[PDB]
A paper describes a structure:
The anti-proliferative mechanism of [name] was revealed by its complex structure complex with [name] (Caf1), and was further shown to be dependent on [name] or CNOT8 but independent of other CCR4-NOT complex subunits. Two conserved regions of [name], termed Box A and Box B, mediate the largely hydrophobic interaction with [name] and are conserved in other family members, including BTG2. TobN138 consists of five α-helices and four β-strands that form two anti-parallel β-sheets.
We employed a fragment screening approach to discover inhibitors of the [name]-[name] interaction. Structures of TobN138 with two inhibitors, corresponding to compounds 1 (i1) and 6 (i6), were determined to 2.3 Å resolution. In the TobN138-i1 complex, i1 π-stacks against Trp93 and is coordinated by the side-chain of Ser53.
Author numbering: -1 to 115
The structure:
Amino acid sequence: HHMQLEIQVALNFIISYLYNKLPRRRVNIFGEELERLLKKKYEGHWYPEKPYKGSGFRCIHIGEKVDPVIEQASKESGLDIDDVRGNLPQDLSVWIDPFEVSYQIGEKGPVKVLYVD
Ligand SMILES: O=c1[nH]c2ccccc2n2cccc12
């Protein structure tokens, strides 16, 4: 029902990797904190008019370095960011733009779409 809905889509996707190698309730906590941090980060950086404006800011990147929002959601969930990294596909990008959520795996991977309207 917003940028909200789209952060949900990305969240669901990301944590989907984490369940069943990381403890259930603490992955739930990881999601909830992730959701909060994205909202807090994306506030005022969301322009349905120019969806691509700030797209590179909003991008969740987990290459050889981890996006702070990921690192923060880990610390606030008691999870070792190395164990979280480990269960997430390497060189992952998730772009969350108005009307579209998409992601790439691997430097030469195709972009895939989770949500578009
Ligand atoms: O890995 C990146 N993907 C990306 C996708 C769309 C827009 C901007 C970016 N971007 C900006 C710094 C880094 C990245």
